[PDB]
Amino acid sequence: GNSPHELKNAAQRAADWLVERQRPNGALPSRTAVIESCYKGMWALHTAGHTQAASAVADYVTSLLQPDGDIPQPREERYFLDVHYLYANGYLTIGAHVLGRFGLSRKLMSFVETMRNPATGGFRSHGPAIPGDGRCDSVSTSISGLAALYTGRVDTARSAADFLGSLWVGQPDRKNVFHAVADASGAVLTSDDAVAVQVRKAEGDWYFIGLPAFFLTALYEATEDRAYLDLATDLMTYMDEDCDEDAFVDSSCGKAGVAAALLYRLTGRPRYREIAEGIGTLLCERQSPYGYWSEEETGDVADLFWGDLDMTAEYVLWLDLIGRNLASGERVWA
Amino acid sequence: GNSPHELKNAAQRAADWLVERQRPNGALPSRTAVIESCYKGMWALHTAGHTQAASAVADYVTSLLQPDGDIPQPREERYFLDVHYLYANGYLTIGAHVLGRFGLSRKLMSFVETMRNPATGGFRSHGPAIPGDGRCDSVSTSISGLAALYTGRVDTARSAADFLGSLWVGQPDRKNVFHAVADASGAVLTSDDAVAVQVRKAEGDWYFIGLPAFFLTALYEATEDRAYLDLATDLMTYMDEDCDEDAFVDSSCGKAGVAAALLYRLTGRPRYREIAEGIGTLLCERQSPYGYWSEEETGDVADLFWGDLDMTAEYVLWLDLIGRNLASGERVWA
Ligand SMILES: *[C@@H](O)[C@@H](C[C@H](O)[C@H](O)CO)NC(C)=O
Ligand SMILES: *[C@@H](O)[C@@H](C[C@H](O)[C@H](O)CO)NC(C)=O
């Protein structure tokens, strides 16, 4: 595979591509003005050293911030309304905090906490303005727990991990389907309108497993509580041995790649290095010659569909995180 | 005056210089192997986007970590023994946390908090192996408060601010001297052996005032409590109007520059922009063409004495922080 330096080089070229096209108000170059086009922008650009561009995204995000600490608009994609509303808020919180925008991160994180279910520790899938039944999903919960870790709200993160453990233990038929959603009481939801990963098919949505694995590994690093490492380990084993090969190939495999790279640094287990290396190389090989990522776009374009802009920022982050955990893991274990 | 982009470009040249000379275990190229040569390295290199190099510093720091969460050795400079012991620990905590090394940041910050005076909110000036009288100083307290902000221990940060307010109110002769130390009871220490800035002379040590100003501004950003903004602006106006011109010229003026840049973004007051621009430009002007900063050396050296290496990482950080707060302040206020 490719070396940590090569993975980082790919991330930097994509970051440069984004910053060259950033708008004067700080928005990233999306064909639609929606928060789901740039929610990873602060954190990704900061990791690439583009701190003025990252702070410009913070300025743009601050201009959207409502008195309750939410960014309810502009939102268009249904997954950011009633599947995992808080997916945007979680990365916004992390990016703001690492930038030292402590007022923005406090306000964002305090809103995120209002959508926690205090009975289960899960985080509600649908936003305040979106009618729903109080269901909570693995992605809202994992990203909110990760934002809790970055902002030092470790008890909130521990509670999120409790929910993930209940969701995992409660699976009715895990060898065929991962039901990523629970009802407001914590029972796993199997209705057709609830996210379900067909683990024996090559149809994506693997990040509903991979993001929990990454969060739980970071929580273990923060706490040294082996219960969290055990659950992250079980989820990685699930993806590696019970899931279709698409789990480490689909566009959403970066989350599992990052979890694997962190688990390698913490445990030294070579399978984790192999998983992270393979995913990092795959993402590197799919990069356009210009710097962005897209499964369809092939030209020298000035902007991107929101999903490709999000993917481009996401892969800046995943390649950086994989690269630094592989490099330090090699120093520690090899 | 240099533009925010130019300040950042200077930081990046220095960061490249450091990374090119980094040692295989992650230590930075110091002529002596001491923690005071590299304590700002994790945070500085991360801000520059050199996350693998920053993680390598974290690996080195982790290998020195003792069971109590301290790094008592290697230390040689007396200021890092009995004047502001925790100055090293504070930057290590911040750099570890921003990298997501949550076990490292938890352990470092927990040790820092064992040195807090629960009656005054100050942090003890002398480390565990160093005898002393329990005195607490403004630099130990402000960097520990900033580390508390980054790790989410906001009550600790508020207590640190209380100590700084008491120190400021209790000054017996602020026109001539800033007494930066209080005894274990919280009373300002005026004895011959306690750090004191000669504010009407050009003799340095201005960061005993400038770092509190930076920390208090960050705490105001985190809480919106105008009491902290008022104290921060008291300190800035003190340095601007009552202190020697050296306060904005000495090698330690970068802390005040960062405080001014943040105050400009938060308040729009043009004088703060002027102070930050002036300090940023002065630091850029002093940079070696080869990328480092040094009090005495010029030309293409392979390494630096610890104080110059510390100053080089420090100015990566300050130029980056000044640049991004000036850039965002211009966006917000114009
Ligand atoms: C994980 O972030 C996954 C998110 C979804 O694709 C978003 O809803 C659209 O960007 N990312 C990828 C690249 O699959
Ligand atoms: C503030 O960090 C100041 C610290 C003192 O110089 C240290 O005691 C020695 O590095 N930095 C500078 C550049 O003045």
What is the 3-class SS of chain B, one letter each residue?
CCCHHHHHHHHHHHHHHHHHCCCCCCCCCECCCCHHHCCCHHHHHHHCCCHHHHHHHHHHHHHHCCCCCCCCCCCCCHHHCCCCCHHHHHHHHHHHHHCCCHHHHHHHHHHHHHCECCCCCCEECCCCCCCCCCCEEHHHHHHHHHHHHHCCCHHHHHHHHHHHHHHHHCCCCCCCEEECEECCCCCECCCCCCCEEECCCCCCCCHHHHHHHHHHHHHHHHHCCHHHHHHHHHHHHHHHHHCCHHHHCCHHHHHHHHHHHHHHHHHCCHHHHHHHHHHHHHHHHHCCCCCCCCCCCCCCCCCECHHHHHHHHHHHHHHHHHHHHHHHHHHHHC
Q: Find the A311 Cα to ligand 1 centroid distance in Å.
A: 6
CA angle B228, B231, B236 (to 5 degrees): 125
DSSP bridge pairs for B178 = B197
DSSP state of A84: -
Please name the residues in contact with B270: beta carbons below 8 A apart, sequence gap of 6 or more. B264
* Ligand 1 touching residue A305 (CB < 6 A): no
Cβ contact A59–B152 (<8 Å)? no
* Ligand 2 touching residue B35 (CB < 6 A): no
Q: Is A123 helix (H, G, I), strand (E, B) or coil?
A: strand
Q: Find the A79 Cα to ligand 1 centroid distance in Å.
A: 10
Domain count, chain B: 1
Residue B202 CA to chain centroid, in angstroms? 20
Distance CA A195, CA A82 (A): 11
* Ligand 2 touching residue B307 (CB < 6 A): yes
Cβ contact A218–B101 (<8 Å)? no
| Size of chain A in residues | 334
Cα atoms in the 13 Å half-sphere on the side-chain side of A31: 9
Distance CA B318, CA A279 (A): 36
Query: Atom of ligand 1 at shortest distance to CA of A253?
Result: 14
Structure tokens of B52?
A: 């693998």
Q: Does residue A70 contact residue A111 with C-beta atoms inside 8 Å?
A: yes
Q: What is the CA radius of gyration of chain B?
A: 18
Q: Is A226 helix (H, G, I), strand (E, B) or coil?
A: helix
* Ligand 2 touching residue B87 (CB < 6 A): no
Ligand at shortest distance from the CA of A206: 1
Query: Atom of ligand 1 at shortest distance to CA of A311?
Result: 13
Query: Atom of ligand 2 at shortest distance to CA of B83?
Result: 8
Resolution of the determined structure in angstroms stands at 1.6
* Ligand 2 touching residue B79 (CB < 6 A): yes
Distance CA A32, CA A35 (A): 9
Please name the residues in contact with B251: beta carbons below 8 A apart, sequence gap of 6 or more. B204, B295, B311
Asked if A226 has any chain B CB less than 8 Å from its own CB, the reply is no
Task: Please say whether the dihedral angle defined by the alpha carbons of residues B98, A42, A136 and A191, taken in this order, is positive or negative.
Answer: negative
Asked if A101 has any chain B CB less than 8 Å from its own CB, the reply is yes
Distance CA B315, CA B143 (A): 16
Structure tokens of B161?
A: 């601010």
Asked if B121 has any chain A CB less than 8 Å from its own CB, the reply is no
Contacts of B24 in chain A (CB under 8 A): 331
Domain with A193, as residue range(s), is: 4-333
Distance CA B115, CA B109 (A): 10
Query: What residue spans of chain A are helical by DSSP H?
Result: 4-20, 41-47, 51-64, 86-98, 102-114, 138-150, 154-169, 207-223, 226-237, 254-267, 270-286, 306-333
Distance CA B54, CA B57 (A): 5
Asked if B102 has any chain A CB less than 8 Å from its own CB, the reply is yes
Q: Is A245 exposed, middle or buried (0-12, 13-18, 19+ CB in 10 A)?
A: exposed
Cβ contact B328–A102 (<8 Å)? no
Q: How far is CA B187 from CA A15, B137, B164, B165, B181, in A?
A: 51, 11, 11, 12, 9
Contacts of A55 in chain B (CB under 8 A): 324-325, 327-328
For B324, the closest of A55, A98, A221 (CB atoms) is A55
Q: Is A117 helix (H, G, I), strand (E, B) or coil?
A: coil
Q: Does residue A103 contact residue B224 with C-beta atoms inside 8 Å?
A: yes
Distance CA B327, CA A56 (A): 8
Query: Atom of ligand 1 at shortest distance to CA of A255?
Result: 1
Q: Are strands A196-198 and B177-179 parallel, antiparallel or unpaired?
A: unpaired
User: Which residue has the least CA distance to atom 12 on ligand 2?
Assistant: B252
| Size of chain B in residues | 334
Does B152 reside within a domain?
A: no
User: Which residue has the least CA distance to atom 3 on ligand 2?
Assistant: B252
Distance CA B203, CA B79 (A): 16
Q: How many CB pairs lie under 8 A apart between chains A and B?
A: 106
Distance CA B88, CA A59 (A): 31
DSSP bridge pairs for A137 = A181
Distance CA B272, CA B278 (A): 10
Distance CA A196, CA A10 (A): 32
Distance from CA of B288 to the nearest CA of A (A): 21
For B59, the closest of A4, A98, A328 (CB atoms) is A328
Mutate-to-test residue for ligand 2 from B76, B140, B207, B258, highest number of ligand atoms within 8 A of CB: B207
CA angle B200, B206, B212 (to 5 degrees): 125
Cβ contact A100–B218 (<8 Å)? yes
Structure tokens of B249?
A: 């010229």
Q: Does residue B220 contact residue B146 with C-beta atoms inside 8 Å?
A: no
Distance CA A260, CA A266 (A): 10
DSSP state of A35: G
Dmax (CA) for chain B in angstroms is 53
Q: Which of A44, A43, A45, A35 is nearest to A85 (CA)?
A: A35
* Ligand 1 touching residue A79 (CB < 6 A): yes
* CATH classification of the domain holding A314: 1.50.10.20
Residue A179 identity (one-letter amino acid): H
* Ligand 1 touching residue A308 (CB < 6 A): no
Cβ contact B49–A49 (<8 Å)? yes
**Crossing angle for the helix pair B306-333 and B270-286, to the nearest 10 degrees:** 150
Does B128 reside within a domain?
A: no
Q: Find the A231 Cα to ligand 2 centroid distance in Å.
A: 45
Residue B31 CA to chain centroid, in angstroms? 22
- Method of determination is X-ray
